Structure 1
Amino acid sequence: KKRKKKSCTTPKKNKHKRKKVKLAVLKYYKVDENGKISRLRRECPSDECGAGVFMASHFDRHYCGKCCLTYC
């Protein structure tokens, strides 16, 4: 027997393309003229994600991308 093609489905299921963001570190910190630094993003309460691993400021929740911890 020979293989039939039958090439017809939903036109194209596209693959997710990751967003390109330039200098994402900067928006985590706010700066005053005096030289102070304030951390805009919350720090996760988990063990590993404690100091430099910031959370996600979603419109209705806080989300840590490293351990899937979520808060209201």
Structure 2
Amino acid sequence: MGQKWKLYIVKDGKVIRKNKFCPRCGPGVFMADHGDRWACGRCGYTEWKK
């Protein structure tokens, strides 16, 4: 089953997490990085990712 939850761009001293929150639900839940759209993964959203 391995391990995969990382690369939420992060260093020491400060953080600016890679992917934004979700505008649909409350904040905290992230979006996709497919490369063409922020699919939002579960709620449906195709803003042609900014």
Shorter-chain TM-score range: 0.5 to 0.7
Over alpha carbons, which structure has the higher Rg? 1
Give the structure-2-normalised TM-score. Answer: 0.67
CA distance in 2, matches of 1:23, 1:52: 18
> Within 5 A, what are the aligned runs for 1:1-72?
20=1, 22-24=3-5, 26-31=6-11, 33=12, 35-46=13-24, 48=25, 50-72=26-48
Sequence identity (%): 40
- Name structure 1 gaps, 5 residues minimum: 1-19
Give the structure-1-normalised TM-score. Answer: 0.52
Across the aligned residues of Structure 1 and Structure 2, the Cα RMSD in angstroms comes to: 1.9
Return the structure number with greater relative CO, CA threshold 8 A, min gap 6. Answer: 2
> How many correspondences in the alignment?
48
1:59 Cα deviation after fit: 1.4
- Name structure 2 gaps, 5 residues minimum: none
Q: More strand per residue: 1 or 2?
A: 1
